[PDB]
Paper text:
TcpB comprises three domains, of which the crystal structures of C-terminal domains (domain 2 and domain 3) were recently resolved, showing that these two domains consist of β-strand–rich folds forming a homotrimeric pilus initiation complex. The structure of TcpB domain 1 remains unknown and is predicted to be a pilin-like domain based on the similarity of its sequence with other T4b pilins. We then analyzed the structure of TcpB alone and in complex with the TcpF (1–15) peptide. The structure of TcpB domain 1 adopts an α/β-roll fold similar to that of other type IV pilins, but the α/β loop connecting the α1 helix to the central β-sheet is outstandingly different. The α/β loop of TcpB consists of 64 residues, which are remarkably longer than the 38 residues of major pilin TcpA, and has a disulfide bond formed between Cys85 and Cys107 in the loop. This disulfide bond in the α/β loop can also be observed in domain 1 of ETEC minor pilin CofB and likely stabilizes the longer α/β loops of these minor pilins. In general, type IV pilins form a disulfide bond in the D-region; however, TcpB has a disulfide bond between Cys85 and Cys107 in the α/β loop instead of the D-region. To confirm the association of TcpB and TcpF in solution, we performed sedimentation velocity-analytical ultracentrifugation. This experiment demonstrated that TcpB (43.5 kDa) is a trimer with an estimated molecular mass of 120.0 kDa. The crystal structure of TcpB domain 1 that was determined here allows us to simulate this situation by replacing one TcpA molecule at the bottom of the TCP filament model with one TcpB subunit. In this model, Glu5 of TcpB can interact with the Met1 amine of TcpA.
The toxin-coregulated pilus (TCP), an operon-encoded type IVb pilus (T4bP), plays a crucial role in this process, which requires an additional secreted protein, TcpF, encoded on the same TCP operon; however, its mechanisms of secretion and function remain elusive. Here, we demonstrated that TcpF interacts with the minor pilin, TcpB, of TCP and elucidated the crystal structures of TcpB alone and in complex with TcpF. Repetitive TcpA units form the filament structure, whereas TcpB displays multiple functions, such as efficient pilus assembly, pilus retraction, and CTXφ uptake. The structural analyses reveal how TCP recognizes TcpF and its secretory mechanism via TcpB-dependent pilus elongation and retraction.
Author numbering:
A (entry chain B), B (entry chain C): 29 to 423
C (entry chain A): 34 to 423
Amino acid sequence: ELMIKSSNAFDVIELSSQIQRYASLSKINNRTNPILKDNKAKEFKDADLKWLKLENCPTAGDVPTTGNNNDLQDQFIACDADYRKGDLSYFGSQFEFSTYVHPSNPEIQRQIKQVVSYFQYRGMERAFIGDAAGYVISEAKKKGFSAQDYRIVLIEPDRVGYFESNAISYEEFIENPSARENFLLKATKDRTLALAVSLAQTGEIAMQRDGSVAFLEDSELCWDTAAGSAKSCLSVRYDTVGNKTELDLKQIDVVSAKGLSFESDGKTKTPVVSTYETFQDGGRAKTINAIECPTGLNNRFAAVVSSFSTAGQNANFSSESAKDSQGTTQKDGSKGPHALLSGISLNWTLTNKVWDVTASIGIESGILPTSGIDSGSLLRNPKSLSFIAFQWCEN
Amino acid sequence: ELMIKSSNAFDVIELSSQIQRYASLSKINNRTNPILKDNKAKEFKDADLKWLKLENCPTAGDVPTTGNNNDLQDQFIACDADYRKGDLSYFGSQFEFSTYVHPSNPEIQRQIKQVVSYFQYRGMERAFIGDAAGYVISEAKKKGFSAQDYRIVLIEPDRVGYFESNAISYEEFIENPSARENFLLKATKDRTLALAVSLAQTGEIAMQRDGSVAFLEDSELCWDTAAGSAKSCLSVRYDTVGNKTELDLKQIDVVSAKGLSFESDGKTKTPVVSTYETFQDGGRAKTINAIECPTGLNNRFAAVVSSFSTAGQNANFSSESAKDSQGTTQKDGSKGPHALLSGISLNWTLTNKVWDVTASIGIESGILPTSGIDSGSLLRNPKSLSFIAFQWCEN
Amino acid sequence: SSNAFDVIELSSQIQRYASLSKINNRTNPILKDNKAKEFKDADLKWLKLENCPTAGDVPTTGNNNDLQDQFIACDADYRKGDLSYFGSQFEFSTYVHPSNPEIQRQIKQVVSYFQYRGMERAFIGDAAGYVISEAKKKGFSAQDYRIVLIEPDRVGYFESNAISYEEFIENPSARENFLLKATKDRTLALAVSLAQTGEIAMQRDGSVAFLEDSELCWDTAAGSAKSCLSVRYDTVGNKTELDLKQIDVVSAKGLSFESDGKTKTPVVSTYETFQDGGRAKTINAIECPTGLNNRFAAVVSSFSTAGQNANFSSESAKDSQGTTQKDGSKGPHALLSGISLNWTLTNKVWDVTASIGIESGILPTSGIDSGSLLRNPKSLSFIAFQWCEN
């Protein structure tokens, strides 16, 4: 049906839907919602609706615009709009709040709990605000407007707003003539009779792509998966025991990263990675490519002893499951028994994105030839050695 | 007017989406969803909807509050809501579950698989439930819900609720008069004719701040970035081959964390972090500060040999790229050749967030003087030693 | 029924379509031409997927594994109701594509016409009311919102007459003025062109992205700047970062990362010593994530030449009672020539063995240790490292 039964009922919904849209927003035209900057638990916004109009109106409203009148602006009602019309005449809205610290917007100091909008009845006979109410409720459903309560109220002026001296639910106004005229008594001359439209702020508020809206405390971000109907979720939770926040990824079996860094006592590192290393024949350094470091982090390295013997070049330690060790070179150049050991040196230097590792094993004197890779009292870059190389980045 | 059908339908979808919302939350107002604590496979909730109302209602419902009434309390339906009216009248909902361990919530014992909400038909000609159901499907599309999988059922009571004895798809009820009239034939006086609603959300549904809307399977969470037009995305996926979920973060170059923990065969670890260590002059114990462990984790330490010789005090190993080693102290007190080695001990003890590290090197007898840091057959906490200290936390 | 919802829903979808160069990683078909104007028809074949029972025009990725981006359903027909879909008029401008010689234009403008078929033509003002209220509800603005009469043109239609929505509503003289020109050579229609003026929400299908530098945040009791995360692009390193650093601890189950293109898990360590008796040591291999293989490395921590006559199992102190002499008794510690640590993976268990070479002529000629070799000695502690990699 595209025919408007009651123009007035239509207007009540049209205005209400925009009040709802406004109450759901933390930002408007990329600026904080004005209503959220104060810290009182209540505020009454006036029937003239200046507070709902753009600040670039001929008469300037309270709703922020972007830097430029250049761009299209988000808006709620026309600059000249007036809803103080008809039998149900807009009377203003009561906003209720609670204190709120937004995790990322410092300008926000409270959050909307509930918005109660009042539409004063100006029909000749008070009782038939009941009929008026019903057409509003009908029109809500027709226009897909979802409010959380409709009530008939009596409101008196307050210190800075209005309060409800008496309230009766819509249902009990039509379907309970005992409570109905129990309520209309109180309709004295400094009280205003009105339809009250309540909007509760629920978990249904949309997560905006600008990140202006936070996930509720203890809520979860979830995926459907091919595992079936079980959802895979993650969350940020705060534990009072220890007073630390946690990004809880434990419903997921594997977190799969590319680059990865973390902090240890203030310092930033990447996870250590390790390799098994031995020297090649010939007595030269073992060259190991330096890992690539993320921005701002420097290369680190450590070599530690795994296996060793005093055989020097006469060995093969490259297999992780067995060691071949043929003895120490004797003065006549032949392989003899394994000499006794006095020390091991492992040195490393980074040049040009390559680590050069050098080593020597010190042995008892008088065994080795005077000259050569194994000579004097030293086995140089020996094959009779395996080490584990550790690499990581840090700042 | 016969737009009583569309209005009845609006309420059906309104209630059904709140029921679906409730079913998707493991916590409500910071407390475990009451329906997830038990361990049965199914449960039927009653048409009176007490279970869906807040416990702070004049007549208390079962939905928890935060405790502090100052707080915004999330809610699903009004305290005086009653959806047992109209041609499609709420009759209760069937929840099916599977057993479940929540990694961070010990109070949870099961997981919702699905919820079906039943609306019994109170029209006097049964055949016209198809017509009523069409309005429901229409109200569903308007709110972003799927138009598929609606069913017309016959349900009967048993001790734990109502079960379906017969079912036909909305589509077959409409198009296949033979199937329709065969289904209706089983609609005996003892069975309740109902529309079975199980809402499914289209991909266009907005994400909500309570987390109750999950991402579609294979959907990603994406950010615009200064890199240009390409998005940067993460996703949660289930591999049917390995039967594991993965949080794929690889499309991002670096995952940058503060504290970090992970699991290895059921145990919680932090990443190993390492320092290069040597003893300072004088032969005394060394102190290394313990890393700060996340709540619940305990400090671990391991020291491994990197370089060593029998020089004892006559050495400097503090550089990673060179070693100064000047031989073992002889009996006259002068530096001599390097003595031969029998062993190396690295020892460590945790005291008040400090690791006390001691070391010694056993050597052949009859070299060292009889007194001093290096004496007898022992080099105490020698300088001629470098070791890598590994630290991590675990439970 | 759902007429007003439908008008805005179709119009938004068409607008979305219009705004897209590719649909399902294939060129938007409407761009593969060079004409300045095209009218697309009421039956909406052009907006339906090609894989519909009756083929539509919207391309497909080819493989049905993933959900195919779509606009309307295969059976959709919006030619009902008092606001009945009449077709969409697109205006284009010239374009030269860098890689596809068939793309020769880009969209400049689209308007969707919904013809009026209500009992009384005057009631189109009411119908336009529901539409505009729905449109604004969803964060849209209509561009030149107007009621029109259209006649067939060279291409598509031209608007022979038009009245703004406000004029039709607030000027009864302008309205019948317009309404009387409604002859048989024209169709009465609502002309809808939607612009997104509200900020939009993140969506279940993941099609909408967080804005550059947006933070995704969670309320907590810890307060500000402790529960937010973001993806930012560092302009100096030209790298993207997932920034979790506000949160005290990221707590994972399994975890993998890449080192120079290779996938790893973090190394995990244990303190190990051999049991009495010279037997080999078994260490259970950690569980690897799908497609990774086990790695192991043992390194020396403490040792002596005591062999069996020792206890190194305590991390804080070492007992070493000397080397077994020829008569089988405990004597002085022998001198050393080497240490081997060996390991082999067999059926999810790492078998670890060790030997310490020592000076000859000390050990007895038979027994647990003989010759010049200590096998799997107690006088040793090593650190064992495990990780997975591909």
